[PDB]
Design an enzyme around this catalytic site. Structure first.
Site, mmCIF file in Angstrom:
data_model
loop_
_atom_site.group_PDB
_atom_site.id
_atom_site.type_symbol
_atom_site.label_atom_id
_atom_site.label_comp_id
_atom_site.label_asym_id
_atom_site.label_seq_id
_atom_site.Cartn_x
_atom_site.Cartn_y
_atom_site.Cartn_z
ATOM 1 N N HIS A 265 0.919 -0.620 0.142
ATOM 2 C CA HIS A 265 -0.125 0.211 0.523
ATOM 3 C C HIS A 265 0.573 1.094 -0.175
ATOM 4 O O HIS A 265 2.073 0.970 1.098
ATOM 5 C CB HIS A 265 -1.178 -0.070 0.883
ATOM 6 N N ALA A 266 0.520 3.064 -0.995
ATOM 7 C CA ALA A 266 1.247 3.371 -1.186
ATOM 8 C C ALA A 266 1.612 4.211 0.088
ATOM 9 O O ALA A 266 0.485 4.059 1.040
ATOM 10 C CB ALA A 266 1.430 4.195 -2.576
ATOM 11 N N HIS B 232 -0.327 12.469 -6.164
ATOM 12 C CA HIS B 232 -0.787 12.679 -4.946
ATOM 13 C C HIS B 232 0.120 11.903 -3.924
ATOM 14 O O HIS B 232 0.864 13.196 -2.712
ATOM 15 C CB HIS B 232 -2.205 10.949 -4.464
ATOM 16 N N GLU B 233 0.797 10.662 -3.960
ATOM 17 C CA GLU B 233 2.254 10.813 -3.092
ATOM 18 C C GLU B 233 3.638 11.915 -3.418
ATOM 19 O O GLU B 233 3.758 12.800 -2.153
ATOM 20 C CB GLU B 233 3.279 9.309 -3.142
ATOM 21 N N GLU C 89 -3.527 15.356 2.550
ATOM 22 C CA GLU C 89 -4.126 14.495 1.335
ATOM 23 C C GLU C 89 -5.132 15.212 -0.164
ATOM 24 O O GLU C 89 -4.200 14.304 -1.089
ATOM 25 C CB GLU C 89 -5.313 13.664 1.766
ATOM 26 N N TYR D 17 -9.552 11.951 4.417
ATOM 27 C CA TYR D 17 -9.858 11.607 2.744
ATOM 28 C C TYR D 17 -11.140 12.402 2.478
ATOM 29 O O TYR D 17 -11.278 12.844 1.326
ATOM 30 C CB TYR D 17 -9.779 9.988 2.263
ATOM 31 N N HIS E 161 2.237 14.691 -0.852
ATOM 32 C CA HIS E 161 3.012 14.522 0.462
ATOM 33 C C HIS E 161 4.185 15.085 0.435
ATOM 34 O O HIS E 161 5.079 15.400 1.630
ATOM 35 C CB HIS E 161 3.112 13.173 0.610
ATOM 36 N N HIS F 15 -6.430 0.415 6.143
ATOM 37 C CA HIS F 15 -6.795 1.531 6.708
ATOM 38 C C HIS F 15 -6.975 1.499 8.247
ATOM 39 O O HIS F 15 -6.934 1.303 9.107
ATOM 40 C CB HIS F 15 -6.846 3.157 6.300
HETATM 41 O O1 LIG Z 1 1.861 7.823 3.055
HETATM 42 C C1 LIG Z 1 1.113 8.470 3.439
HETATM 43 N N1 LIG Z 1 0.027 8.642 3.556
HETATM 44 C C2 LIG Z 1 -0.661 6.789 2.501
HETATM 45 C C3 LIG Z 1 -1.825 6.001 3.227
HETATM 46 C C4 LIG Z 1 -0.649 5.848 4.171
HETATM 47 C C5 LIG Z 1 -1.021 6.451 5.087
HETATM 48 C C6 LIG Z 1 -0.405 5.539 6.781
HETATM 49 C C7 LIG Z 1 0.590 4.608 6.692
HETATM 50 C C8 LIG Z 1 0.950 4.222 5.843
HETATM 51 C C9 LIG Z 1 0.085 4.193 4.119
HETATM 52 P P1 LIG Z 1 -1.646 7.406 0.912
HETATM 53 O O2 LIG Z 1 -2.944 7.855 2.146
HETATM 54 O O3 LIG Z 1 -0.817 8.676 0.495
HETATM 55 C C10 LIG Z 1 -1.667 6.376 -0.125
HETATM 56 C C11 LIG Z 1 -3.102 5.868 -1.117
HETATM 57 C C12 LIG Z 1 -2.846 7.505 -1.798
HETATM 58 C C13 LIG Z 1 -3.798 7.069 -3.087
HETATM 59 C C14 LIG Z 1 -4.558 5.782 -3.860
HETATM 60 C C15 LIG Z 1 -5.051 6.892 -5.285
HETATM 61 C C16 LIG Z 1 -5.768 6.061 -5.594
HETATM 62 C C17 LIG Z 1 -5.570 6.158 -6.802
HETATM 63 C C18 LIG Z 1 -6.430 4.955 -8.056
HETATM 64 C C19 LIG Z 1 -7.498 4.614 -7.577
HETATM 65 C C20 LIG Z 1 -7.297 4.308 -5.701
HETATM 66 C C21 LIG Z 1 -6.207 4.900 -5.498
HETATM 67 N N2 LIG Z 1 -4.640 8.345 -5.186
HETATM 68 O O4 LIG Z 1 -3.770 8.306 -4.102
HETATM 69 C C22 LIG Z 1 -4.532 5.853 0.169
HETATM 70 O O5 LIG Z 1 -4.126 5.473 0.736
HETATM 71 N N3 LIG Z 1 -5.706 6.006 -0.843
HETATM 72 C C23 LIG Z 1 -6.427 5.913 -0.232
HETATM 73 C C24 LIG Z 1 -7.880 6.900 -0.656
HETATM 74 C C25 LIG Z 1 -8.184 7.428 -2.067
HETATM 75 C C26 LIG Z 1 -8.083 7.220 -2.695
HETATM 76 C C27 LIG Z 1 -8.078 8.346 -4.061
HETATM 77 C C28 LIG Z 1 -7.488 9.795 -3.631
HETATM 78 O O6 LIG Z 1 -7.638 10.609 -5.369
HETATM 79 C C29 LIG Z 1 -7.030 9.751 -3.036
HETATM 80 C C30 LIG Z 1 -7.409 8.085 -1.598
HETATM 81 C C31 LIG Z 1 -7.389 4.649 -0.794
HETATM 82 O O7 LIG Z 1 -6.425 3.797 -1.348
HETATM 83 O O8 LIG Z 1 -8.091 4.036 0.320
HETATM 84 O O9 LIG Z 1 1.146 9.290 4.376
HETATM 85 C C32 LIG Z 1 0.877 10.585 4.235
HETATM 86 C C33 LIG Z 1 1.356 11.378 5.421
HETATM 87 C C34 LIG Z 1 2.151 11.126 5.975
HETATM 88 C C35 LIG Z 1 3.227 11.956 7.322
HETATM 89 C C36 LIG Z 1 1.960 13.675 7.532
HETATM 90 C C37 LIG Z 1 0.901 14.012 7.442
HETATM 91 C C38 LIG Z 1 0.745 12.569 6.241
HETATM 92 ZN ZN LIG Z 2 -2.092 9.944 0.218
#
Ligand SMILES: O=C(N[C@@H](Cc1ccccc1)P(=O)(O)C[C@H](Cc1cc(-c2ccccc2)no1)C(=O)N[C@@H](Cc1ccc(O)cc1)C(=O)O)OCc1ccccc1
Ligand SMILES: [Zn+2]
Ligand SMILES: *[C@@H]1O[C@H](CO)[C@@H](O[C@@H]2O[C@H](CO)[C@@H](O[C@@H]3O[C@H](CO[C@H]4O[C@H](CO)[C@@H](O)[C@H](O)[C@@H]4O)[C@@H](O)[C@H](O[C@H]4O[C@H](CO[C@@H]5O[C@H](CO)[C@@H](O)[C@H](O)[C@@H]5O)[C@@H](O)[C@H](O)[C@@H]4O)[C@@H]3O)[C@H](O)[C@H]2NC(C)=O)[C@H](O)[C@H]1NC(C)=O
Ligand SMILES: *[C@@H]1O[C@H](CO)[C@@H](O)[C@H](O)[C@H]1NC(C)=O
Ligand SMILES: *[C@@H]1O[C@H](CO)[C@@H](O)[C@H](O)[C@H]1NC(C)=O
Length: 598
Positions: free
Chosen positions: A321-322, A351-352, A379, A491, A355, A481
């Site tokens: 998980h990214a 997205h990443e 986010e 989110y 961050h 999560h």
């Molecule tokens: O790495 C993270 N956070 C990640 C999650 C995480 C949290 C804690 C520990 C480990 C990991 P993420 O949300 O980047 C990792 C990803 C991002 C993502 C997925 C997508 C995506 C696009 C197309 C299709 C499907 C997904 N787009 O962006 C994430 O968790 N996304 C959410 C929901 C999401 C979906 C779409 C979107 O545009 C944004 C968010 C999920 O997958 O459920 O930390 C950020 C951070 C760090 C320090 C202080 C503040 C913030």
């Molecule tokens: Zn994120």
């Protein structure tokens, strides 16, 4: 006197912040090593370092009481001290804290190690969520194959960790109470610094819900034509396995079968990316260019040297998980992403890097301020870019979208495609925390925990499992999560405020004018806008130094979270879709699901 003490306190905080940064770096390295390479040894070390840091933070919280900090003149000093009094899990007794950490790693490692057997070949049992199972969920249009993978995944990622999850809820509650919050829900909600924040989200969700109903209705209509009435009823919740995604959180993967104008262009550049020989490295380089094109900060060399941007091909386990990582030094920032060459993954990359950009923008701040203005801001940053990256305008510029005619019908296809991700997600994200808040607050008996989950997924999203679940199953931890204990409201907040950011950035870039048919919000590209970038710089450089309304004010002069911008974006879709549902006599709404037995 307090005058002399406030001078000493200022020097005390200055040294302490630097100490916290340095100590956290050591924890972060150990966490990074575990997540990149899951072993019993790496777990032990991650958890032992955290325990050490927890201990030190206890000491710090205790030391704050020797300063009359509430009496001070400086709002800034006071804000920093307040931050140091908030211990989170570190408030727990030593043994309780260690049990919690073992519980959390048990859950995250279980999630990460899930393997299922191939539908067509039960001798091949090395299919992982990412990429194998997710490829199937997104591409297969065989409803039985879809349901097989759903049941296998949820049984292994969800039900398998019920007793660990129960213990985590107890320790999470215990920790919150030791910080004098009522529950973990109030602990999470404290990050937003606003005692009406839940009501604000309810009000905004209520305004957007009618649009979601219309989208839900139309999609259900179109799925019935594809799968037939045996698989999809007119009046019931949608079987969630048909929605292109394991959690039904976004539905854009089934755009090919539910798009309003099937004979008009639907943007899906994955094929062109592959044809042009794109790699993960190229994708991150392009994300980088996007940020630097706006006069924001280029990625530092440590990022390229230390990031993991492809799933490893040795035998090992890891969390795919990214994630984006800040090591709290200077320019040591990294991403871990099991990157694939697809359109959705290109958005994820941006997205990443949002961050990472926030990390770089606030690294000069005192440690306690090196975080988002609220979790939603963090986010949102990258998603503002992904919105313009997603436009036909931008995808044509980078040569990924060819022979595209942007007539009225193609516009509706693209608006719907975006809605399938942006509107659909709202109720989903709200339920992830509504569920956990209700468990944290003691509102649901343990005997009703699984049907409390599916009940919310029905009430808000109008989806249901493909098969009958019961309280023998435990399905929530099948979402990353939830297994990894990551607050999810961030989110929902992000999906709302990102349109406030996007709209304002588009106006600043000369890319949106409401009274000009040539500059529609849904085709705005902020690439290369230094005006847009300046706004991002002003906001992001603040970190958490001020309450979040001041960070928003720094961006666009507003101080309120509002659903106006997101509604404004989709207004052309809403007009069209309402009329289309009336034209096709589309049933709206849903009966109560029969899929979770008490
Ligand atoms: O790495 C993270 N956070 C990640 C999650 C995480 C949290 C804690 C520990 C480990 C990991 P993420 O949300 O980047 C990792 C990803 C991002 C993502 C997925 C997508 C995506 C696009 C197309 C299709 C499907 C997904 N787009 O962006 C994430 O968790 N996304 C959410 C929901 C999401 C979906 C779409 C979107 O545009 C944004 C968010 C999920 O997958 O459920 O930390 C950020 C951070 C760090 C320090 C202080 C503040 C913030
Ligand atoms: Zn994120
Ligand atoms: C969550 O809420 C908790 C309350 O529900 C809270 O716990 C309370 O914290 C208090 C400290 O803030 C603490 O108060 C102390 O009590 C000492 C003795 O109390 C005993 O009896 C209790 C009743 O049964 C037992 O339960 C306890 O276990 C105790 O053993 C007092 O001796 C102590 O006093 C000293 O300190 C005060 C404070 O001085 C402050 O600073 C300066 C001093 O330089 C003053 O000028 C200033 O005005 C200010 O008052 C001095 O005034 C005094 O002279 C003594 O030096 C103190 O009052 C309380 O015991 C404790 N628990 C409970 C159950 O009450 C948690 O702190 C909250 N948690 C978080 C994270 O915020
Ligand atoms: C993973 O960590 C282990 C420690 O348990 C170590 O021996 C090994 O070098 C690491 N493997 C990889 C591929 O980095
Ligand atoms: C880049 O940022 C600087 C200050 O950080 C600013 O003065 C300048 O306007 C920006 N570049 C452009 C082309 O606007």
């Amino acid at each position: 006197a307090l005058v002399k003490e406030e001078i000493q306190a200022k020097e005390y905080l200055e040294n302490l912040n630097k100490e916290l940064a340095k100590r956290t770096n050591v924890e972060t390295e150990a966490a990074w090593a575990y997540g990149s390479n899951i072993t019993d040894e790496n777990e032990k070390k991650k958890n032992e370092i955290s325990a050490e840091l927890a201990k030190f933070m206890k000491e710090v919280a205790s030391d704050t009481t020797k300063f009359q900090w509430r009496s001070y003149q400086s709002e800034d000093l006071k804000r920093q001290f307040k931050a140091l009094t908030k211990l989170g899990y570190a408030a727990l007794p030593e043994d309780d804290y260690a049990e919690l950490l073992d519980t959390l790693s048990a859950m995250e490692s279980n999630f990460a190690k899930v393997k299922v057997c191939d539908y067509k070949d039960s001798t091949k049992c090395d299919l992982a969520l990412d990429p194998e199972i997710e490829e199937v969920i997104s591409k297969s249009r065989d409803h039985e194959e879809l349901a097989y993978y759903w049941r296998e995944f949820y049984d292994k990622a969800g039900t398998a960790v019920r007793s660990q999850f129960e213990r985590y809820v107890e320790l999470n509650t215990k920790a919150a109470k030791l910080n004098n919050f009522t529950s973990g829900a109030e602990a999470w909600l404290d990050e937003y610094e606003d005692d009406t924040f839940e009501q604000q989200l309810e009000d905004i969700f209520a305004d957007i819900r009618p649009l979601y109903q219309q989208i839900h209705g139309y999609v259900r209509f179109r799925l019935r034509k594809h799968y037939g009435d045996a698989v999809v009823s007119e009046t019931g919740p949608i079987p969630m396995h048909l929605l292109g995604n394991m959690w039904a959180q976004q539905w854009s993967e089934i755009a090919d079968i539910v798009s309003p104008f099937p004979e008009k262009p639907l943007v899906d550049v994955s094929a062109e990316m592959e044809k042009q020989g794109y790699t993960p490295l190229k994708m991150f380089q392009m994300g980088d260019d996007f940020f630097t094109s706006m006069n924001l900060t280029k990625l530092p060399q440590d990022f390229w040297d230390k990031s993991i941007i492809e799933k490893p091909t040795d035998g090992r386990d890891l969390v795919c998980h990214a994630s984006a990582w800040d090591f709290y030094l200077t320019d040591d920032v990294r991403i871990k992403q099991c990157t694939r060459v697809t359109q959705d993954q290109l958005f994820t990359v941006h997205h990443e890097l949002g961050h990472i950009q926030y990390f770089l923008q606030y690294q000069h701040q005192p440690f306690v301020y090196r975080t988002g203005a609220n979790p939603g801001f963090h986010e949102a940053v990258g998603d503002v870019l992904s919105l313009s990256v997603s436009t036909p305008k931008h995808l044509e510029k980078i040569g990924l979208l060819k022979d595209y005619v942007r007539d009225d019908e193609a516009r509706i296809n693209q608006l719907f495609l975006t809605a399938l991700d942006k509107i659909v997600f709202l109720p989903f994200a709200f339920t992830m925390d509504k569920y956990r808040w209700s468990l944290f607050r003691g509102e649901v008996d343990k005997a009703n925990w699984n049907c409390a989950f599916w009940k919310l997924r029905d009430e808000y999203s109008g989806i249901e499992p493909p098969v009958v679940r019961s309280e023998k199953d435990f399905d929530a931890p099948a979402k990353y999560h939830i297994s990894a204990d990551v607050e999810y409201l961030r989110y929902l907040v992000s999906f709302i405020i990102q349109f406030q950011f996007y709209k304002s950035a588009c106006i600043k870039a000369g890319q949106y004018d409401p009274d000009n048919v040539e500059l529609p919000l849904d085709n705005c590209d902020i690439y290369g806008s230094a005006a847009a970038g300046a706004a991002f710089h002003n906001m992001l450089s603040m970190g958490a130094s001020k309450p979040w309304p001041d960070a928003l004010e720094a961006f666009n002069g507003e101080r309120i979270m509002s659903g106006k911008a997101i509604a404004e974006y989709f207004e052309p879709l809403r007009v069209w879709l309402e009329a289309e549902n009336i034209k096709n006599n589309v049933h709206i709404g849903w009966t109560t699901s029969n899929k979770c037995v008490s």
